[PDB]
Structure formats: C-alpha cells, structure tokens
C-alpha cells in the first residue's frame, strides 16, 4: 500500500506529462494506483 505523500508525488508526475490533476485522479482511481496503466488509460483510452 502507498503512502499518501507517495501517491501525490506519482499524481504529479504524471501530471508532468501535460495531464489536469482531475484526469490523472481518475486514471488511477481506474487503475488501482499501478502507474503503468494509468498513463496506459491517459495515452490511449480507459478499458472498453
């Protein structure tokens, strides 16, 4: 389980890539945390 702060620092990260913070919110809500498909889903589209 991550820590909190370790979550904010893996949200802003991927925020780096020209991600709103709301999105990457609910890509990795959408992926459990796992980072690999979070931007997965912001690159290419969330499952379905």
Do not use: K
Not at 10 to 31: C, D, F, K, N, Q
Request: charged share 20%; hydrophobic share 40%.
């Amino acid at each position: 389980l991550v820590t909190g702060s370790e979550y904010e620092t893996m949200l802003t990260e991927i925020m780096s890539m020209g991600y709103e913070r709301e999105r990457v919110v609910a890509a990795l809500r959408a992926s459990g945390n796992n980072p690999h498909r979070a931007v997965e889903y912001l690159l290419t589209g969330i499952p379905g």
